[PDB]
Amino acid sequence: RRRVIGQRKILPDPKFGSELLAKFVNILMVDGKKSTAESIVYSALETLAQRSGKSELEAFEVALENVRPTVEVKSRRVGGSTYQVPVEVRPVRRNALAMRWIVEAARKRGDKSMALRLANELSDAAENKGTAVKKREDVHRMAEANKAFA
Template sequence: MAQKNIYPKRVSRNLSVPEKGSGKTPTFCSNFYRLRSKFINILMKSGKKTKAHKIFSLGVMKAPIALIRAIENVKPVVEVIKKPLGRKIIEIPSLIKPLRQESLAIRWILEGVRKRSAPISNSLLSEVKDALSLMGYARKKRDLLHKKVEASRINVRFSRFPTSPKKVLASANDVTLHLIKVRHSNPYSRSGKDSGAA
């Protein structure tokens, strides 16, 4: 007689995570709670999550719409990646995935907060207000990155989705639109489903 297996089956930890391309659109509340947990985790130092949660609550917990709009204003769309070409290292424009866009925006906001001399909760609120009005440290970092993309726009021909030799890209916005258009038109690209709205 075969002996029964008394050990429970291993359950995957990712059962509650929806699959990519499942068609489920996140609601405002789910989006805010996800951004809140990400914000608190990046703000946390030395494992002091309760302290980070308190700072977040005193700063921007009462204005969730302002926080989401501030992150949207600060999110970069394109970046430059360094790639060796012969004996040189060139900077090639590349699209940023949506989750990395959020992470960069939150990091830049917190860098601006730590550069201020006021209490951290007040500084967080001030930095979010500046980001809403397209100002502040985080917005400057985004504009600086887009200027770097604009300066290296000639190197788009070395990317995975090159331009034609006769096509001239005038600005960072043109680089973004070109990369999005060619990525979505390429059926063999792995990240063809990624959306990189400008």
């Protein structure tokens, strides 16, 4: 209902720096061992800077600029009428949604080493080359007509 506790404000880190980098080392935590991601954070960028971008300073800026959700899609009904509806996303966490879509695919794909499973994912993310994105776009494209209502 309406209460619900107030949603959290997260944190930065005194070494990892920004709130998103402090999220990167804490998201998709499994088995709780809490020493695995601190060798993978800002460590896939030196090859990215010679594969799908430039410098270790912009290699992750461009990844969250190529992966940029601007609209969400969801069902909406009003009595005996149902539509798939598009809604604009709020900007404040927009780049953290895009981050999640990369770090999960390195877990859901099982090919060679973990020293490859994320670097190989990021080099397509920095180019907007994600899996099945043509059929993903085909839903948002179909829902665009429902901003005209009935």
